[PDB]
Write an enzyme that holds these catalytic residues in place. Structure first.
Site, short mmCIF file in Angstrom:
data_model
loop_
_atom_site.label_atom_id
_atom_site.label_comp_id
_atom_site.label_asym_id
_atom_site.label_seq_id
_atom_site.Cartn_x
_atom_site.Cartn_y
_atom_site.Cartn_z
N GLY A 47 0.79 -1.25 0.00
CA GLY A 47 0.00 0.00 0.00
C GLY A 47 0.81 1.29 0.00
O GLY A 47 2.05 1.29 -0.10
N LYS A 48 0.11 2.40 0.10
CA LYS A 48 0.74 3.73 0.16
C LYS A 48 1.42 3.92 1.54
O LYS A 48 2.47 4.59 1.63
CB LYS A 48 -0.31 4.82 -0.09
CG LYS A 48 0.20 6.27 -0.09
CD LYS A 48 -0.99 7.26 -0.01
CE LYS A 48 -0.54 8.73 0.04
NZ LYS A 48 0.12 9.27 -1.22
N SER A 50 1.95 1.13 3.85
CA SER A 50 2.53 -0.07 4.40
C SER A 50 2.62 -1.19 3.40
O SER A 50 2.05 -1.10 2.32
CB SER A 50 1.65 -0.53 5.55
OG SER A 50 0.50 -1.17 5.04
N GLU A 51 3.34 -2.26 3.81
CA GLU A 51 3.38 -3.55 3.11
C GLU A 51 2.86 -4.60 4.08
O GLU A 51 3.19 -4.57 5.26
CB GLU A 51 4.79 -3.95 2.63
CG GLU A 51 5.51 -2.91 1.82
CD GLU A 51 6.51 -3.53 0.81
OE1 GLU A 51 7.49 -4.20 1.23
OE2 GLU A 51 6.32 -3.34 -0.42
N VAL A 52 2.01 -5.48 3.58
CA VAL A 52 1.32 -6.40 4.43
C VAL A 52 1.76 -7.82 4.10
O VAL A 52 1.81 -8.19 2.93
CB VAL A 52 -0.20 -6.21 4.31
CG1 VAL A 52 -0.95 -7.27 5.14
CG2 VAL A 52 -0.57 -4.75 4.71
N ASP A 155 -11.82 6.17 6.41
CA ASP A 155 -11.35 5.48 5.18
C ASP A 155 -12.21 4.21 4.94
O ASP A 155 -11.72 3.14 4.71
CB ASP A 155 -9.86 5.16 5.29
CG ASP A 155 -9.20 4.92 3.90
OD1 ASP A 155 -9.73 5.31 2.82
OD2 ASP A 155 -8.12 4.30 3.90
C1 EMO Z 1 -4.18 -7.58 1.07
C2 EMO Z 1 -4.37 -7.44 2.58
C3 EMO Z 1 -4.62 -8.60 3.35
C4 EMO Z 1 -4.80 -8.50 4.73
O1 EMO Z 1 -5.05 -9.66 5.40
C5 EMO Z 1 -4.77 -7.22 5.37
C6 EMO Z 1 -4.50 -6.06 4.61
C7 EMO Z 1 -4.30 -6.15 3.22
C8 EMO Z 1 -4.43 -4.80 5.20
O2 EMO Z 1 -4.22 -3.79 4.46
C9 EMO Z 1 -4.60 -4.67 6.61
C10 EMO Z 1 -4.55 -3.41 7.27
C11 EMO Z 1 -4.75 -3.33 8.66
O3 EMO Z 1 -4.70 -2.12 9.24
C12 EMO Z 1 -4.98 -4.46 9.44
C13 EMO Z 1 -5.02 -5.71 8.78
O4 EMO Z 1 -5.21 -6.85 9.50
C14 EMO Z 1 -4.86 -5.81 7.40
C15 EMO Z 1 -4.94 -7.09 6.78
O5 EMO Z 1 -5.18 -8.08 7.54
#
Ligand code: EMO
EC number: 2.7.11.1
Length: 330
Positions: A47-48, A50-52, A155
């Site tokens: 993302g903008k 973070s990376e998940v 958001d």
């Molecule tokens: C593709 C993708 C899979 C995920 O399981 C999450 C996210 C993105 C994610 O952006 C995310 C943001 C967050 O603030 C908490 C999460 O558990 C998450 C996520 O769990």
């Protein structure tokens, strides 16, 4: 003269009655967890902010999700963490399990409870009329709870609502833009994703509240029942208001700017025009009619109002006829 002030209709003063520690996040002290506890398995998304990743907690063999934060003001990190902590345990709120220092980015990595999403790009294509009411109802639980706890999500959009369809389980995620609501506060209007932005944000009215999330929810609902995702598909923040105005009309838009004495950006002059307010029937066709009902439209209508004070609260939303059958089966 300057815009007319505004206050949330509900949960106006919740934060003022809290210990200041609850909302004064700049003073929050993070206690780190152990980063050797988690081994990254694979990359889920980028993302903008973070990376998940999917990861394993090796102490207890559990699957977790790890959000490695891209560099950002520490204030913003404290804000997200304090919100997640204050909301932990609330219905359909993602659970923050730990906070660690990534050995690589040297930034914080937030660790959440695992969830097993069907991405909304394949899901919304398969949703029944009933599932839409069921899932909307579960989102409203999360929003009424966070609203009641003095927080706006800011958001709300399909990416941020994880659904484990097999288990009929929903989590509202990504609290990184969330804020504490305080009466009289002027917020940044550069929040939310373009297609889900409220008119308050698009005309730069800063004294907004929880009701921002209800407009976003209205945008999601529109795209599920009409099968047009995103529903108001603008190219930029200007064109976004124009796309809305083509549906909701310009007369209500200008009553709204007049009421709050909002200084409309000179750029809006030649692009807005004059537009009648359309009947929802014009978006109904053979492929979506099975999702649209008199109840769905009455409900949608009551969410998609320019005047943020006019929109249903999450709690009012939950008493709408649209949800009688889901409230019964629950
Ligand atoms: C593709 C993708 C899979 C995920 O399981 C999450 C996210 C993105 C994610 O952006 C995310 C943001 C967050 O603030 C908490 C999460 O558990 C998450 C996520 O769990």
């Amino acid at each position: 003269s300057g815009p007319v002030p505004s206050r949330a209709r509900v949960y106006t003063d919740v934060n003022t009655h809290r210990p200041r520690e609850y909302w004064d996040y700049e003073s929050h002290v993070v206690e780190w967890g152990n980063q050797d506890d988690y081994q990254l398995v694979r990359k889920l998304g980028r993302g903008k902010y973070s990376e998940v990743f999917e990861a394993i907690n090796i102490t207890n063999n559990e699957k977790v999700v790890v959000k490695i934060l891209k560099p950002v003001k520490k204030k913003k990190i404290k804000r997200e963490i304090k919100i997640l902590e204050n909301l932990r345990g609330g219905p359909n709120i993602i659970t923050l399990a730990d906070i660690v220092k990534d050995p690589v980015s040297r930034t914080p990595a937030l660790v959440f409870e695992h969830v097993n999403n069907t991405d909304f790009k394949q899901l919304y294509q398969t949703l029944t009329d009933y599932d839409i009411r069921f899932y909307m109802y579960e989102i409203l639980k999360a929003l009424d709870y966070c609203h009641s706890m003095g927080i706006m999500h800011r958001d709300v959009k399909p990416h941020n609502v994880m659904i484990d369809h097999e288990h009929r389980k929903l989590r509202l995620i990504d609290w990184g833009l969330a804020e504490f609501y305080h009466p009289g506060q002027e917020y940044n209007v550069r929040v939310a994703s373009r297609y889900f932005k409220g008119p308050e944000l698009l005309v730069d009215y800063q004294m907004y509240d929880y009701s921002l999330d209800m407009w976003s929810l209205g945008c999601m609902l529109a795209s599920m029942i009409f099968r047009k995702e995103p529903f108001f598909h603008g190219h930029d923040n200007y064109d976004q208001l124009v796309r809305i105005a083509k549906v909701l009309g310009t007369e209500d838009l200008y009553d709204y700017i007049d009421k709050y004495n909002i200084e409309l950006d000179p750029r809006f002059n030649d692009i807005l025009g004059r537009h009648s307010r359309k009947r929802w029937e014009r978006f109904v066709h053979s492929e979506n009619q099975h999702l649209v009902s008199p109840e769905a439209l009455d409900f949608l209508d009551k969410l998609l109002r320019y005047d943020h004070q006019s929109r249903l609260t999450a709690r009012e939303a939950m008493e709408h006829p649209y949800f009688y059958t889901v409230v019964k089966d629950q």
